C-alpha cells in the first residue's frame, strides 16, 4: 500500500496533507522551493528535498524534479494538492508511467474533464444537467449559428473548449464577429480554436457537489457548497450546505454526480461545479482534485476528505456508505489572505505576531506562525478560518467572533473584508448570487 | 432574560464563557484582579471592573466586590466558572438575595451536595449507587464501629463529611484510634467532627457523568468522561466516552443521575463523579458547576454546555431531548500547564512565542497569546488541547500530532508529560486506573 508520500505542494494544503499522512502512519517527503525551507510542513516532514529556486515554474511546476524526488526517496505515491500540477494530465501520466501512484484520477479522466466540450458531453451522457447550449462545437455557418443562438435564447456566451477565453453576446447583431473572434483568440493562446455556445445565466449562484469514488466501484456524494461570495472569479467565503437546497434536491443532483463518476471511471475526490439559478442546476466544470474549501464539507458530514483520498489511492474502499452520510449543521470558511483589504495588492512580509482564534466550533487550517515571512512568489493565502454551527446563524456569529480574536501583525490582511461580508444583511439572509461581492464593493 | 453577565472568573474558562455570551448576544462584564488586566477575555469584554489586587483572596474570592460589580453595571447574572466561588453556597445565596441570577444551582442544593454525608443520603434516596459504607455518621462505640467495618470489609476509609481529611484503615487493630484522629482533625480545621466510613476501593477508575437540568422539569445525561489520568489528585488527561462503557450501562447510570437531579431540585450543569471498579459504579461526589474537562463531552455529543448553562439560567428549557443525544466518536483533552514537566513546579513568565496547533478534529481552548505573561498568583493552566476522532485511536494519534506542532517558548510546560502518556502502551489499550500515572512516574 501507501508507505511514503511525496507532498507535491506547499502552504496550507501541504500541511493538511502532512497531517492526514501522519495520522495514517504514512511517511512524508516534502518537496519545496528554496523560498519555502521554513514552511511549517517542511519542518515537520520526515524527509525534505529542494526541487528548485523560488519561481513556481522552476519548482512546484517542475515535473522532472518532483518525479525524481519520489524516485530517490523510494516513495509510493504523490499528492498534488490543489493548483500547481493537480490537474495537469501530463504530470499524472508521467507519475503513473514512472511507477508511482498519483493521488487523483487517471490522466485520461483529467484530460476528459479538462476539455469543456468533452466534459459536457460526458455529463449529458450521465444525466447530469448542463447549460442549454450548442452541444458540441459551433460551425462557421452564421445562419446555423444564428439559429442555435436563437434556440438557446440571448444572451448567450461563446466559450473556448480549451479556455480558462469567453465572450457574452446579447444580440444577433454581434454574433458572427464574436464567434470568429473567440475562435481566433483561442487558437493563438491555446492552439485550440474549438468553441461552443451556451446560455449566459445572468443571476446564478455557485453551488458545487463534493464526490468520492473508489476502485471498488463505489461513489458517494457529500452534499454541496455555496461558493458565490467571490471577487474577480476568486473565492472569498464558502459555506455548506447551500442555503435553499433540500435533502430531496440534494439526493437528486448528488446521485447524478455519483453516477457520472462511475460512468467516466472517476477515482478519488472531485467536485462538480454548477451554476444554480431559478431553482435549477447547470453543470459548468468538474474539478478533478481536492479543493481549498473542502473543510466546510468535512464539518457538516464528518468525513475526512484527504484521508479518504489517501485510502482510495492505496486501493481501499471509501470508509462509509451513502446511507451513512447525513448533513448536520452548517459551516463557513473565510480565506485569510496577506493582501491589502481594499486594493487587494499582495502584502508579503514578516508576521511579527500571530494570534489564532479557538474554542468550540472553530477550526484553523494554516501554515503561518509568528516569525514566519510570507513570500512574494506564490498566492497570498495564509490561513483558512472555518466555523461550525447547528444553524447558519450560529456559524456566522462564530465566524464574526473568531475573526475579532484573530491578530496578524506585520502584514495587511483581508480580515476587514470578511467582517464587512459577515455583517451584510443580504449575506445574513443567505442566497446571494455570484455578482454580489463585486456589486457591494462598487 | 439574560442581557448582561458578570464573568466571575479568569483564564481559559472566562474566555470560554465570554465566547458563549457573545454568540448569544449577551453583554459581558469582566471582573479581574490588577494582575489580570491583560487577560484575553478582559480585552474582549464589553465592560471591565478591577475587583482587587493580585491575590485570589482579595479579588476572585471577594464576594462583596463581585456583587458590587454586578450592581454598578446593572448586570442580570453572574457566571462563577469553576474553582473560585463556584461551589461557595454563601456566594450563591448572596448573589440571589441581591437580585441577580446565579448561573448554577440554588445555594441549598450546593450545600446539600457539599456535605458528603447528606450528598450520599440524597444519592441513595434517588437510586444512584454509592460506595458500601456506614450510611450516616459513625458512633464512638468501637464495638459498633468494628462491626460496621467488618460488614463493609477491610480496607475501609474514614472520611470527614466536611472534608476536602481521609484515613485508610486496613485492620481492626487500627480502627478505634483512626476514627478518633479523623474526628479531631476535621473538628479543628473544619469546625465539623462528623465522619463516616466506607469501603476503600483499591483499583478504581474515575468515571463521571455530565448532566443538565432546567427549570422546566427536564434533566438529561450526556454520556461520561474517564478522568483517571491524574497525579496528586490533579487531572492531566481526560477522555470521553469512557472505555468499556456500553450504551446500555450508560443509559442505566445516566438515567439514575438525571432522576437524582429532579429529586434534589438541581438546576444547571453538573457532574456526578464515580469510582468505577470491577464493572460497578460507586458515587463519590457531585460537582455542582461546569468543569475543566467539559469540552470532551461537547465533542462526542454536539452539545454546547456553557450555552446551555446560560439558557437554563435565563429560564429556558434545555435545547434538546434525551433521545436527541447519541455518542459519536471519541475525544481527548490534555491540560497544558506552565510548569516544569518533571518537578511540576510552576513556570511563570513571558510567552515569547506561542504556536498553537490546528486542523481537522483539533480544538484549542486557551487565553494565552504570544507576548502574554503567565502570572504567579493563580493556577498554572494555560491551555486545553482537545482532539476528536471517529475512534479512540484516531483521537490519540491526533493529540500526539497536535502536541508535536505546539510551541510555547519562554516558559516550561507539561507537554513532555502528555507525550509520554499518549505513547504509553497501557494508556493506548485503555482503561488504566487512577493510580497509573503516579506508578508510571515512580
Ligand atoms: N453559461 C454561463 N453563464 C454565466 N456565467 C458563466 C457561464 N459559464 C461560465 N460562467 C462564469 O465564467 C467564469 C469564469 O470561468 P473560468 O474561466 O474562471 O473557469 P475556470 O473554473 O477553469 C478558472 P477558475 O475556476 O479558477 O476561476 C466563472 O466565474 C463562471 O461563473
Ligand atoms: N471510597 C474510596 N475508595 C478509594 N478512593 C477514594 C474513595 N473515596 C475517595 N477516594 C479518593 O480520595 C481522593 C481525594 O478526594 P478529594 O479530597 O480530592 O475530594 P474533592 O473532589 O472534594 C477535591 P478534588 O476533586 O479537587 O481532588 C480522590 O482522588 C478519590 O479518588
Ligand atoms: Cl481549489
Ligand atoms: Cl473543574
Ligand atoms: Mg473551477
Ligand atoms: Mg471532585
What's the 3-state SS for B420-433?
A: HHHCCHHHHHCCCC
Q: Which residues are registered as beta bridge partners of A158?
A: A167, A197
Give the helix/strand (H/E) hosting A397: helix A392-405
Starting at the earlier edge strand, list the strands of the sheet with B234-240: B280-287, B268-277, B205-213, B219-231, B234-240, B330-337, B381-389, B362-365
Angstroms from A134 CA to nearest CA on chain B: 44
Kindly identify the ligand whose nearest atom is closest to the C-alpha of B132. Answer: 2
Q: What secondary structure letter does DSSP report for A244?
A: T
Three-state secondary structure call for residue A32: strand
Q: Decide which of 3.40.640.10, 3.30.1490.20, 3.60.90.10, 3.90.1480.20 is the CATH code for A131-200.
A: 3.30.1490.20
Q: B356 vs A359: CB contact, 8 Å cut-off?
A: no
Give the span between the Cα atoms of A199 and A64, in whole angstroms: 42
Of ligand 2's listed atoms, the one at least distance from the Cα of B234 is: 27
- HSE-CB of A90 using CA atoms within 13 angstroms: 6
CB distance B311 to B268 below 8 Å: no
* CB within 8 Å of A64: residues ≥ 6 apart: none
CB distance A430 to A332 below 8 Å: no
* Window 144-183 of A, Cβ < 8 Å to B: none
Give the span between the Cα atoms of A93 and A110, in whole angstroms: 10
Residue B133: which of B200, B205, B183, B184 has the closest Cα?
B200
Residue whose grid cell is 474526628: B183
Q: Which residues are registered as beta bridge partners of B425?
A: none
- Binding-site members of A for Mg(2+) are 273, 285, 287
Q: Which of B164, B198, B379 to mutate to test the pocket of ligand 2 (most atoms within 8 A of CB)?
A: B164
Which of A19, A358, A407 minimises the CB distance to B364? Answer: A358
The residues of chain A that CATH labels 3.30.1490.20 are 131-200
Using the mean position of ligand 1's atoms as its centre, give its distance from the Cα of residue A251 in Å. 25
C-alpha cell read off for A58: 522552476
Q: Are strands B205-213 and B219-231 parallel, antiparallel or unpaired?
A: antiparallel
Kindly identify the ligand whose nearest atom is closest to the C-alpha of B384. Answer: 4
Give a three-class secondary structure readout of B287-355. Answer: ECCCCCCHHHHHHHHCCCHHHHHHHHHHCCCCCCCHHHCCCCCEEEEEEEECECCCCCCECCEECCEEE
CB distance A303 to A320 below 8 Å: yes
Kindly identify the ligand whose nearest atom is closest to the C-alpha of A234. Answer: 1
Give the helix/strand (H/E) hosting A225: strand A219-231
Give the span between the Cα atoms of A237 and A235, in whole angstroms: 6
CB distance B264 to B275 below 8 Å: no
The region, left, alpha or beta by phi > 0 then psi within -120 to 50, assigned to residue A422 is alpha
CB distance B90 to B102 below 8 Å: no
- Helix (H) and strand (E) counts for chain B? 15, 20
Q: Is B115 in the pocket of ligand 2 (CB under 6 A)?
A: no
Establish whether the linkage from the previous residue to B329 is cis, with ω within 30° of 0.
no
Q: What secondary structure letter does DSSP report for B60?
A: T
Establish whether the linkage from the previous residue to B241 is cis, with ω within 30° of 0.
yes
Here the contacts of A170-174 (C-beta below 8 Å, separation 24 or greater) are A172/A146
CB distance B273 to B292 below 8 Å: no
Per CB-CB distance under 8 Å, the chain A contacts of B298 are 360
Q: Roughly what angle, to the nearest 10 degrees, separates helices A107-114 and A89-97?
A: 170
Q: How far is CA B300 from CA A75, A307, B257, in A?
A: 37, 20, 19
Give the helix/strand (H/E) hosting B24: helix B11-24
CB distance B130 to B282 below 8 Å: yes
Q: Is B119 in the pocket of ligand 2 (CB under 6 A)?
A: no
C-alpha cell read off for A298: 468535512
Residue A390: which of B359, B15, B298, B331 has the closest Cα?
B298
Three-state secondary structure call for residue B154: coil
A205 in contact with B, Cβ within 8 Å: no
Establish whether the linkage from the previous residue to A241 is cis, with ω within 30° of 0.
yes
Give the span between the Cα atoms of B237 and B300, in whole angstroms: 16
Q: A356 vs B360: CB contact, 8 Å cut-off?
A: no
C-alpha cell read off for B165: 481529611
User: Is CATH 3.40.50.20 the right assignment for the domain spanning A1-85?
Assistant: yes
Give the span between the Cα atoms of B45 and B59, in whole angstroms: 18
Please list every protein residue whose CB sits less than 6 Å from any atom of ligand 1.
A 131, 157, 164, 166, 198-201, 233, 275, 284-285, 434
Q: Decide which of 3.90.320.10, 1.10.287.110, 3.40.50.800, 3.30.470.20 is the CATH code for A86-130+201-442.
A: 3.30.470.20
**Does the annotation count A232 as an active-site position?**
no
Residue A427 neighbours by CB distance under 10 Å:
20
Residue whose grid cell is 472566562: B14
Q: What secondary structure letter does DSSP report for B54?
A: S
B321 in contact with A, Cβ within 8 Å: no
Q: Which residues are registered as beta bridge partners of A29?
A: A6, A47
Using the mean position of ligand 3's atoms as its centre, give its distance from the Cα of residue B5 in Å. 43
CB distance B52 to B36 below 8 Å: no
CB distance B258 to B221 below 8 Å: yes
Angstroms from B372 CA to nearest CA on chain A: 11
Give the span between the Cα atoms of B17 and B22, in whole angstroms: 9
Task: Tell me which of A289, A363, A392, A398 is the catalytic residue.
Answer: A289
Q: Give the burial class of B279: count Cβ atoms within 10 A of its Cβ; 0-12 exposed, 13-18 middle, 19 or more buried.
A: exposed
Q: Pseudo-torsion of CA B293, B221, B435, B87, nearest 10°?
A: 60
Q: Which residues are registered as beta bridge partners of B74?
A: none
The region, left, alpha or beta by phi > 0 then psi within -120 to 50, assigned to residue B239 is beta
Three-state secondary structure call for residue B214: coil
Give the span between the Cα atoms of B287 and B19, in whole angstroms: 23
Which of B304, B358, B398 minimises the CB distance to A23? Answer: B398
* Window 64-83 of A, Cβ < 8 Å to B: none
If you take atom 9 of ligand 2, which residue's CA is the nearest one? B284
Q: What share of chain A is helix, strand, coil (3-state, %, to 5)?
A: 35, 25, 35
* Window 337-356 of A, Cβ < 8 Å to B: 353-356
CB distance A6 to A73 below 8 Å: yes
Using the mean position of ligand 1's atoms as its centre, give its distance from the Cα of residue A274 in Å. 10
- Binding-site members of A for Mn(2+) are 273, 285, 287
The residues of chain B that CATH labels 3.40.50.20 are 1-85
Per CB-CB distance under 8 Å, the chain B contacts of A302 are 328, 390
Residue B402: which of B435, B356, B369 has the closest Cα?
B356
Of ligand 1's listed atoms, the one at least distance from the Cα of A202 is: 4
Q: Are strands A330-337 and A381-389 parallel, antiparallel or unpaired?
A: antiparallel
Give the helix/strand (H/E) hosting B78: strand B77-79
* CB within 8 Å of A326: residues ≥ 6 apart: A301
Strands of B86-218, DSSP E:
101-102, 156-160, 166-169, 195-199, 205-213
Q: B390 vs A295: CB contact, 8 Å cut-off?
A: no
Find how far residue B406's CA is from the centre of its chain. Answer: 25
The residues of chain A that CATH labels 3.30.470.20 are 86-130+201-442
Give the span between the Cα atoms of A434 and A234, in whole angstroms: 11
Give the span between the Cα atoms of A254 and A269, in whole angstroms: 14
Q: Which residues are registered as beta bridge partners of B197?
A: B158
- What does the radius of gyration of chain B's CA atoms come to, in whole angstroms? 22
* CB within 8 Å of A10: residues ≥ 6 apart: A32, A33, A36, A39, A60, A81, A378
Residue B418: which of B303, B302, B305, B336 has the closest Cα?
B336
Nearest CA in chain A to B14: A359
CB distance B271 to B240 below 8 Å: no
Give the helix/strand (H/E) hosting B30: strand B27-33
Q: Is B233 in the pocket of ligand 2 (CB under 6 A)?
A: yes
CB distance A271 to A210 below 8 Å: yes
Residue B283: which of B128, B109, B145 has the closest Cα?
B128
Residue A197: which of A157, A155, A141 has the closest Cα?
A157
Q: What secondary structure letter does DSSP report for A280?
A: E
Give the span between the Cα atoms of B232 and B343, in whole angstroms: 13
* Window 1-30 of A, Cβ < 8 Å to B: 15-16, 19, 22-23
Amino acid at each position: 500500500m501507501l508507505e511514503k508520500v511525496v507532498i507535491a505542494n506547499r502552504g496550507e494544503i501541504a500541511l493538511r496533507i502532512l497531517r492526514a499522512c501522519k495520522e495514517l502512519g504514512i511517511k512524508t517527503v516534502a518537496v519545496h522551493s528554496t523560498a519555502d525551507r521554513d514552511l511549517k510542513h517542511v519542518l515537520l516532514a520526515d524527509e525534505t528535498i529542494c526541487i528548485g529556486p523560488a519561481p513556481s515554474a522552476k519548482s512546484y511546476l517542475n515535473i522532472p524534479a518532483i518525479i525524481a524526488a519520489a524516485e530517490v526517496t523510494g516513495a509510493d505515491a504523490i499528492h498534488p494538492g490543489y493548483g500547481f500540477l493537480s490537474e495537469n494530465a501530463d504530470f499524472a501520466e508521467q507519475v503513473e508511467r514512472s511507477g508511482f501512484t498519483f493521488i487523483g484520477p487517471t490522466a485520461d479522466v483529467i484530460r476528459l474533464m479538462g476539455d469543456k466540450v468533452s466534459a459536457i458531453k460526458a455529463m449529458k451522457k450521465a444525466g447530469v444537467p448542463c447549460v442549454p447550449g450548442s452541444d458540441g462545437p459551433v460551425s462557421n455557418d452564421i445562419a446555423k449559428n444564428k439559429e442555435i443562438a436563437k434556440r438557446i435564447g440571448y444572451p448567450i456566451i461563446i466559450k473556448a473548449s480549451g479556455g480558462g477565453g469567453m465572450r457574452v453576446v446579447r444580440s444577433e447583431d454581434a454574433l458572427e464577429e464574436s464567434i470568429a473572434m473567440t475562435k481566433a483568440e483561442a487558437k493563438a493562446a491555446f492552439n485550440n480554436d474549438m468553441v461552443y455556445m451556451e446560455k449566459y445565466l445572468e443571476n446564478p449562484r455557485h453551488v458545487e457537489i463534493q464526490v468520492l469514488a473508489d476502485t471498488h466501484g463505489n461513489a458517494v456524494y457529500l452534499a454541496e457548497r455555496d461558493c458565490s461570495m467571490q471577487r474577480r472569479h476568486q473565492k472569498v467565503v464558502e459555506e455548506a450546505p447551500a442555503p435553499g437546497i433540500t435533502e430531496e434536491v440534494r439526493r437528486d443532483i448528488g446521485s447524478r454526480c455519483a453516477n457520472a463518476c462511475v460512468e467516466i471511471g472517476y477515482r478519488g475526490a472531485g467536485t462538480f461545479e454548477f451554476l444554480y439559478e431559478n431553482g435549477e442546476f447547470y453543470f459548468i466544470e468538474m474539478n478533478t482534485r481536492i479543493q481549498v474549501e473542502h473543510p466546510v464539507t468535512e464539518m457538516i458530514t464528518g468525513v475526512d476528505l484527504v484521508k479518504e483520498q489517501l485510502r482510495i489511492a492505496a486501493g481501499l474502499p471509501i470508509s462509509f456508505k451513502q446511507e451513512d452520510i447525513k448533513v448536520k449543521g452548517h459551516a463557513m470558511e473565510c480565506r485569510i489572505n496577506a493582501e491589502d483589504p481594499k486594493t487587494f495588492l499582495p502584502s508579503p512580509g514578516k508576521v511579527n505576531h500571530l494570534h489564532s482564534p479557538g474554542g468550540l466550533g472553530v477550526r484553523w487550517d494554516s501554515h503561518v506562525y509568528g516569525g514566519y515571512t510570507v513570500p512574494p512568489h506564490y498566492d497570498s493565502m495564509i490561513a483558512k478560518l472555518i466555523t461550525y454551527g447547528d444553524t447558519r446563524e450560529v456559524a456566522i456569529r462564530r465566524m464574526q467572533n473568531a475573526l475579532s480574536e484573530t491578530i496578524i501583525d506585520g502584514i495587511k490582511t483581508n480580515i476587514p473584508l470578511h467582517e464587512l461580508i459577515l455583517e451584510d444583511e443580504n449575506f445574513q439572509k443567505g442566497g446571494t448570487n455570484i455578482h454580489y461581492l463585486e456589486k457591494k464593493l462598487g
